[PDB]
Each structure stands twice: as structure tokens, then as C-alpha cells.
Amino acid sequence: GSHMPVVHVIDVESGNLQSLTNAIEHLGYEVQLVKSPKDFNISGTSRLILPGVGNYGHFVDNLFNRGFEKPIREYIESGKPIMGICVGLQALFAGSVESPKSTGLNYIDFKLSRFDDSEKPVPEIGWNSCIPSENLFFGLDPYKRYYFVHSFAAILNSEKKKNLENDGWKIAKAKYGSEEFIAAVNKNNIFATQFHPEKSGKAGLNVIENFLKQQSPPIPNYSAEEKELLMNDYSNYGLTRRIIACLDVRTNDQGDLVVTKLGKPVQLAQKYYQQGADEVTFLNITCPLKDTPMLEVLKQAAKTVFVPLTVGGGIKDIVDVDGTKIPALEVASLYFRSGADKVSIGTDAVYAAEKYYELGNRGDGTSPIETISKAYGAQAVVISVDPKRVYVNSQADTKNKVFETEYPGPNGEKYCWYQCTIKGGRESRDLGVWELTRACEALGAGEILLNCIDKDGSNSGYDLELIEHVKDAVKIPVIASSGAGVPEHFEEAFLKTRADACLGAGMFHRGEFTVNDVKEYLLEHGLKVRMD
Numbered sequence: 001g002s003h004m005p006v007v008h009v010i011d012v013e014s015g016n017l018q019s020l021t022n023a024i025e026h027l028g029y030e031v032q033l034v035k036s037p038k039d040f041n042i043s044g045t046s047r048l049i050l051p052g053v054g055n056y057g058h059f060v061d062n063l064f065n066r067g068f069e070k071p072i073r074e075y076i077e078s079g080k081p082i083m084g085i086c087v088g089l090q091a092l093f094a095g096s097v098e099s100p101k102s103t104g105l106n107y108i109d110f111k112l113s114r115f116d117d118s119e120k121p122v123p124e125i126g127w128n129s130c131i132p133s134e135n136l137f138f139g140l141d142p143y144k145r146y147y148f149v150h151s152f153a154a155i156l157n158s159e160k161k162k163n164l165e166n167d168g169w170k171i172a173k174a175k176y177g178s179e180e181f182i183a184a185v186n187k188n189n190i191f192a193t194q195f196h197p198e199k200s201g202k203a204g205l206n207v208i209e210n211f212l213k214q215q216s217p218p219i220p221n222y223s224a225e226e227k228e229l230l231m232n233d234y235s236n237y238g239l240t241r242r243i244i245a246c247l248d249v250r251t252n253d254q255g256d257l258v259v260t261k262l263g264k265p266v267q268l269a270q271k272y273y274q275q276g277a278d279e280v281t282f283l284n285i286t287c288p289l290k291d292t293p294m295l296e297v298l299k300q301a302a303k304t305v306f307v308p309l310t311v312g313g314g315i316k317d318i319v320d321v322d323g324t325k326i327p328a329l330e331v332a333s334l335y336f337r338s339g340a341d342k343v344s345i346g347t348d349a350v351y352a353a354e355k356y357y358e359l360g361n362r363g364d365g366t367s368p369i370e371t372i373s374k375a376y377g378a379q380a381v382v383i384s385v386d387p388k389r390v391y392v393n394s395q396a397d398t399k400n401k402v403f404e405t406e407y408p409g410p411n412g413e414k415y416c417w418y419q420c421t422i423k424g425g426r427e428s429r430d431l432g433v434w435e436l437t438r439a440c441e442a443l444g445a446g447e448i449l450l451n452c453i454d455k456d457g458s459n460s461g462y463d464l465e466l467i468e469h470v471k472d473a474v475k476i477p478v479i480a481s482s483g484a485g486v487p488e489h490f491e492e493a494f495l496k497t498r499a500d501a502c503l504g505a506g507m508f509h510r511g512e513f514t515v516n517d518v519k520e521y522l523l524e525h526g527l528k529v530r531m532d
């Protein structure tokens, strides 16, 4: 309470706050959560952090509803250090197009807009860099990567950058595709980042430490060889080749949690993080909702794993042990507050998509995809697709969209579509992958986890045509999954397809290769990867 520096963190009791708290404590500070304006006074606060997550309006409304506007302004007026993270940075602006009627602190007199999806996938999900500048601050290093996860940003042009310049603002810029936007801002005692430092590994922890210690250390003295290797070449729109490590979570005979048919999933996640994983996905496949074992795994993993965590399995409307009807939104909220950054929807995604087409290509606003994305944004919803190839002689043989394949079927069929399955692949549905992804994308999904039942655990590579087929269908990031066995497979997916990321389960779990082994190979072949 006074034996270490206290850091006040504003808590609107929504989203993942575990990572930020753990990151601050890991730096040797004590965290004091401020859920109400009554929980903190100006003179008794030396370090204030305004963490934001989800939909702009859902955050700003909640924040101002609690009466935080004046306290925040009075704190900023006191001249003491404040750090805004994600929506914490967006709140400094006039508002956002994500929530038209919502307002902002208006320190920067313009609104955040949506990235152009005509040239790249929106939301931006991945590791981007700050463009080299003379006015960088708090240790922001152009040769390092930070994690961005957003659809809206403060998009720049000459006029805006100049007004901000003359206004006394220091701007850390970043580019996604052909669009330049604000990655971070700094003026007097105000600091804010569009990226999540608590999710950016060591590079991220350094940014937090630099703010808490109020220092702008010089960037390491890199050689012309190191710079040329670490610089952003703007391949894959400026995002590094994202390597995702995934693990299954099952319950054995005794009731304990294991990854092979509650410390094992936790320790493996820590290992994956220590060995270079850009993301860790937990597939829950294992009792009251509050006491769910998977929630505790997230909590434990979130203590040392400073990269985004995804959880999938059973995210839908449920009937708890006591009979209480808990909507999918509340289930996802529980997982988020427990350490998860994104939730994966499989079975309920196929249902929602079928319903979508029956209603004449519209949603009724009740599906997990719709409610979760409206509260936490599209970047918080992942669709887990579990497809299988079905051959046909022509488009006339099915209502589902087909494509011409390079690999003829058993009877010489030159066309095929991919059929969706539910409940761990135990049941098929008369819905194609083309129809499923497009539907879910419309309902609000922000990313597609594209598995392939035929390639699952085969270590023979990814289903390249499937990847390209889905990339033709949607404008949201698509993750290549199922089939990864060797580093060459990742390279193949990244060069021969438009895959926005690569996921691996078996190969990492077998210790055959580590995430770093895959990264070393990609780096050796000229691809950009996160190395921290």
C-alpha cells in the first residue's frame, strides 16, 4: 500500500484486465483497481492507466456513466502521468465511427474511422511496427513489434499530422496496407497506445515500464545488417507472419486437465510463449459456470503469457447447473475477465449461419456472433470452421458454391465444395464453408480459424485450395490450420496463399519443432516474423 509504487487502473469491469495487472505487478508495482470515481483522489494518484477494450461506445458510455470524465480531466490537468491503452487512446479523440452517437474526451479534435477493407483484411490483427521518427517516445522501437487488434483507428493524412504537430503532439505512426494511422500519442503528461503493450511480450512490458518510470530510452544501436532484417518491408500489409500455437484441453478419468487423451495446459502455454508463440489458442473440450476449470487455466496462463489468448469450446447460450439462463455474451465476458482475449465459436456458428440465410441474409441480433461482437468488437470473435471436401461433377449437383480444383475426385470430378460439421466433427450440415464464413462475417465475426478435418494431425501440410477459397469469400483475416508438420509448411502457406496466419497443434506439442524453429526458417527465407 506504500511498500511499492502504486499504479491506479480504471476498471469498467469489462474485458481482459488480467494481463495488464499481471504485467504491472511483474514490473514491481502494486495495482489499485478504480471501479468508481470514489476509489481514487487526484493527490493520491501518481500513475493512472486508462485501459480500454471492445466497442468504443460500449466503453466510453460505461466510463462516463460512472462519472469518470471530470476526474480524468482533473488528473490530466494536475500534470501527472496517464497512459491510455486501446479504447483508452481512442477516448482521447472526438469519438469513433464504431459508435456514432458516443463522445470522447476530445483532446484530439477528430474521429476514429474504419480501415479500408478493399485492399486488406479488417480488423487488423497482428504485429505491426512504428515508423522511424525523430520524435519517438517511451522506448517505442521501430525494429520491434507490438500487437494490434482493431477495425478502427486514427487514420492520418498530411493535414492531420501537421495540425497535431503544431498542437504540440508527438505521434508514433504505423502503416497497415497503404493507410497510415496513430500507433501512439504523447503530449505533456498524456501517453496512449493503439496497440496492447500487455499483449506485446517483452517489447510491450518495456513500454509499460518506460511509462511508469517516465523515460524515453534510446533505441538499441543496431547494425545496418540488423536493421535491414528487422525493418518492416510492408509485405503481408505490414504485419509479421503470425505463428499460433494451439492446445486441446481434456478431462481424464480422475478429472484432471491434460492436453493428451490443471497444470499441463498451463505449463505448455508458458512453454509456447517462451519459445516464440505469437498467440496461444486453447480448445476446451472438457460443474457450474463460475467454477469451470478452463477459466482457471486462463487465469494462471495470463500471469506470465504476455501474448493474446484465444479460447474455444462451449461458447453459446447455456443453462447453468442451477438452471439460470446465461446468454453467450455473459459466458464470453466471464472468459474475457479470466484472461481470454478472443473466443472461438464453432457449432453455434453453423447454426447462426443457417438461420441467417433463412431470414433472407439478415440476423435477428441474438446469435453469440452478434451479441459478443457488438459489445467487444469483431476482433473478439473467431469462427472455428471444421470442413471437409465434397466432390461434385458440376455446380448443378449442389446448392452450395463450388470451385474448380486442381485435384480431380475419385470419379474424375473437377469441382468441389467444403461441407461444415458441428459437435467436434460428429455431425455434418448442408452448409458450405463459402456460405458459413460469409454469413458469420456479416453477423460480426472478425477472424476465421480455418481447420480441415482431412489434414488434421496429418503433418502433410495445409489444404492450400481451401485457404484460397475462403480468402475469395471474406474480407476478414483467415488463419490457416490443420496439417502443419514442418517449418516448410508455414512458408508454403505464406507464399502460395493469402493466409493471414498459421496455426499448429501437434508439431509443437510433440516437441518436433518449437515456434522459434519455424520462425528461424521463415526469417532465413526472407519473411518477417516477431523475434523478442
Ligand SMILES: NC(=O)c1ncn([C@@H]2O[C@H](COP(=O)(O)O)[C@@H](O)[C@H]2O)c1NCNCC(O)[C@H](O)[C@H](O)COP(=O)(O)O
Residues within 6 Å of the ligand: 246, 283, 284, 285, 312, 313, 314, 315, 344, 345, 346, 347, 348, 384, 385, 386, 422, 423, 424, 425, 451, 452, 455, 456, 457, 458, 459, 481, 482, 483, 484, 503, 504, 505, 506, 507
Ligand atoms: N472433440 C474435438 O476433437 C473437438 N471439439 C471441438 N473442437 C474444436 O473446438 C471448436 C469449438 O467448439 P464448439 O463447437 O464451439 O463448442 C470447434 O469448432 C472445433 O474446431 C474439437 N477438435 C479440434 N479439431 C480441429 C483443430 O482445430 C486442430 O486444433 C487443428 O487441426 C490442429 O491441427 P494439427 O495437429 O494438424 O496442427
Ligand code: NI
Residues within 6 Å of the ligand: 001, 002, 003, 004, 030
Ligand atoms: Ni505498500
